[PDB]
């Protein structure tokens, strides 16, 4: 059971270039490569990657090629230049995963047993998702379902490292916004923080429309049982939470009589100091 993966920011980048290498002839719309990593704890780390020649045909949709020979020797070279690094899994792109991914994963679990795949989104780069990591489990099934492979979820993030954030800050130099700017910046944090509140809402909007309609089979295990836990929270009981709002008056009180008065009086000093310096330099000009 893997806790989470850590995206070193060289690997994604090194997927973008190889998608751009074949992209002049790119019509396969997918690039499989090998995900090198550093196994630390239950938490996982990723440091490097490389590619592999890959083909696949939708006709019979099981005809494909992972070059074992290319995977042995080139990883052997990265072992020689760096003994710290080993394989932890693989990756592909083209955000809709395809039916073959059971076959690639169950093949190269004989290189690392708890292997893990990461889907990146090279063209989608817009709203809320950097990557995603999948994992395989095989229990009986459930209480009552037929057995299968069933790609499961591992939560993901983007990590960093000292002496690579230097390459982050120096290569961008573009907008260079700090978190400070507490009037302008924090309000916009509340703005687009809420623009994802309806974005996750419109996603949970669309899911129960197409399962109440009843197209896809209802996941009786987690897909609403975790929502059954969720939908009781929102407590808004009034007549004691109405009495939260003299603390609102208390938070107001420091703003009103302290910050409006002193800011006005200090700028009033700048009037008399200027009106003296105006005319006493004017009457001494002649």
């Amino acid at each position: 059971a893997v806790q989470k993966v850590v995206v070193h920011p060289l690997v994604l980048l090194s997927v973008v270039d190889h998608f751009n290498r074949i992209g002049k002839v790119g019509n396969q719309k997918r690039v499989v490569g090998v995900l090198l990593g550093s196994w630390q704890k239950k938490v996982l780390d990723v440091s490097n990657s490389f590619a592999v020649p890959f083909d696949e045909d939708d006709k019979d949709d099981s005809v494909w090629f992972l070059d074992h020979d290319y995977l042995e020797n080139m990883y052997g070279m990265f072992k020689k230049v760096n003994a710290r690094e080993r394989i932890v899994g693989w990756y592909h792109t083209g955000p809709k995963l395809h039916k073959n991914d059971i076959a690639i994963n169950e093949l190269m679990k004989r290189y690392c047993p708890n292997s893990v795949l990461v889907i990146i989104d090279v063209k989608p780069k817009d709203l809320g998702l950097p990557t995603e990591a999948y994992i395989s489990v095989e229990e009986v099934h459930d209480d009552g379902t037929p057995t299968s492979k069933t790609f499961e979820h591992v939560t993901s993030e983007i990590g960093a490292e000292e002496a690579e954030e230097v390459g982050v800050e120096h290569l961008l130099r573009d907008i260079k916004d700090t978190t400070v700017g507490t009037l302008s910046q924090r309000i916009t944090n509340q703005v687009h923080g809420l623009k994802g509140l309806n974005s996750k809402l419109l996603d949970i909007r669309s899911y129960l429309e197409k399962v109440a309609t009843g197209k896809l089979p209802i996941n009786h295990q987690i897909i609403y049982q975790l929502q059954d836990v969720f939908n009781l929270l929102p407590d808004v009981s009034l007549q004691e939470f109405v009495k939260a709002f003299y603390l609102k008056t208390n938070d107001q009180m420091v703003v009103v009589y302290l910050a409006s008065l002193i800011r006005s009086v200090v700028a009033l000093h700048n009037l008399i100091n200027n009106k003296i310096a105006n005319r006493d330099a004017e009457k001494k000009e002649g």
Binding site: S184, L197, L208, Y224, D228, L232, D235
Partner: protein
């Protein structure tokens, strides 16, 4: 049946629907708190039973339909009142 709208249930509703006597509704709810399918509390001067409930189970498809309507009211409150904030604070946004 009432999803936390006014979840402070009165004792007579339990004593009628469970058809248990009035004096044993307290020993009945202390057992359900002892098992752990509910995490409420008990008043006795008013004999109203306050409810906080964390135990999940199946919901027959019909309760998704009511869950859709509550999610749609949830939609236009988030959507329209964000348009209020953005149009008000547009010039300090950048």
């Amino acid at each position: 049946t009432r999803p936390a709208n006014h979840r402070q249930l009165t004792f007579e509703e339990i004593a009628k629907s469970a058809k248990i006597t009035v004096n044993e509704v307290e020993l009945l709810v202390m057992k359900a708190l002892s098992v752990g399918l509910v995490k409420g509390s008990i008043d006795e001067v008013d004999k109203r039973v306050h409810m906080t409930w964390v135990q999940p189970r199946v919901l027959d498809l019909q309760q998704i339909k009511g869950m859709k309507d509550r999610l749609e009211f949830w939609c236009t409150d988030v959507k329209s009142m964000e348009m209020l904030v953005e149009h008000q604070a547009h010039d300090i946004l950048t």
